[PDB]
Amino acid sequence: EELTYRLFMVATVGMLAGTVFLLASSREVKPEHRRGVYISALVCGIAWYHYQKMGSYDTGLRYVDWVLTVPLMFVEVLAVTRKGAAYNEAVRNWGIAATVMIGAGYYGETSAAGSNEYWTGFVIAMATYVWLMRNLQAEGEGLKGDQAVAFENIKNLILVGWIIYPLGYIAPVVGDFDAIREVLYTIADIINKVGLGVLVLQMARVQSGEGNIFANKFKGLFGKKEMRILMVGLDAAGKTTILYKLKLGEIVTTIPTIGFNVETVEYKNISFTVWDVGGLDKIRPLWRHYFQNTQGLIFVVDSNDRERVNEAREELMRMLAEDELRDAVLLVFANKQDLPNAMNAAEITDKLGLHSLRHRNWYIQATCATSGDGLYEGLDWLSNQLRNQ
Ligand SMILES: Nc1nc2c(ncn2[C@@H]2O[C@H](COP(=O)(O)OP(=O)(O)O)[C@@H](O)[C@H]2O)c(=O)[nH]1
Ligand SMILES: *C/C=C(C)/C=C/C=C(C)/C=C/C1=C(C)CCCC1(C)C
């Protein structure tokens, strides 16, 4: 009896420790994948509040915790492998299945052990349990690389760790084991809830990493609407390197006239057009054929090139004078931050005179095109300005 109360005290402290850790590390994940770890911290917080409360024992106290957390634990798993309509369909179906599973378990546990109502709730709960575990096994078939390995660990934890619950359910009918049921339930809750949140965190950590061999890092940013983006800058600013790093498609290089090189990348309804500004004066008039309906203007500048930083400003200001780009949102990539002589973002802002720009929605991001750092942050801002406005 005293061991059952000691585990309730350990569970309360354990759930709270996993709550703050899951919250403290949530800032490292990109905002696209932070929803999973937020739910993960919410599961431990709900378990902490209910284990603080834990005639006789209160079965309803634990089943109230299960009926809320189990669907949420499926939400943070489905938020990893699905998105959009497929995510909402699975959350509804799995949440309903978990609700019937937990509800049937409460119907049977609140009856006489070994009675027909006890086994009926066991039969219904096991059927939905097998259904949930079969759908979980079939999840993540499209994942590859580190995400597939990370999701395999999430699957294995639930597929193995949740077996303790039906075993603990049948303990009262295989022996004088009323106390070991709460022991099995409590230890399983600590292992599964704290464990899944850690595994959900490591998953979202992978989805936010710089490795992009499978080309998934920058696709969940721009959405489905039309978005014409012009990315210009001086030669050797890093524009082609950024195009490759986006992993949004093969670069299409054209030469419409001798001395004018154009690079395009198309994905969904999103397009990047790239050329070098400056150069010969006879080339500048040809840029006007590409300005119409441009929604985003990305200006790349070599932060390590201090001799040409003043010409970079002159080209940007000439571009911002074009009437066809009066509504274009400006995003400035302070590229090559990894180089030792690289000017910081505030210095590039001062050298380019961005604070003098009126009626212009702009933003500057320090970036390293070789490693990709900063590219997601700048594009997430640009995508947010163009989608929400
Ligand atoms: N160290 C460093 N080098 C970069 C970075 N971005 C581009 N480069 C280098 O700059 C050189 C030319 O860049 P490029 O993409 O061709 O610039 P573009 O002419 O505007 O397309 C390449 O050799 C890149 O390796 C960066 O962020 N850091
Ligand atoms: C955070 C709490 C967790 C993950 C609880 C999970 C509960 C289940 C997997 C247990 C379901 C049951 C059966 C499969 C059979 C007997 C009745 C239940 C409810 C114990």
Author numbering: 2 to 55, 62 to 396
Task: Copy the relevant paper text.
Here, we have functionally and structurally characterized a representative of the PR family found in a widely distributed clade of marine actinobacteria, Candidatus Actinomarina minuta, named MAR [marine actinobacterial rhodopsin or MacR (16)]. In summary, the sequence alignment and the photocycle measurements confirm that MAR is a member of the PR family, which functions as an outward proton pump at neutral and high pH. Overall, MAR consists of seven transmembrane helices, A to G, connected through short intracellular and extracellular loops. A retinal chromophore is covalently bound to Lys200 of helix G. The fold of the MAR is similar to that of other PRs.
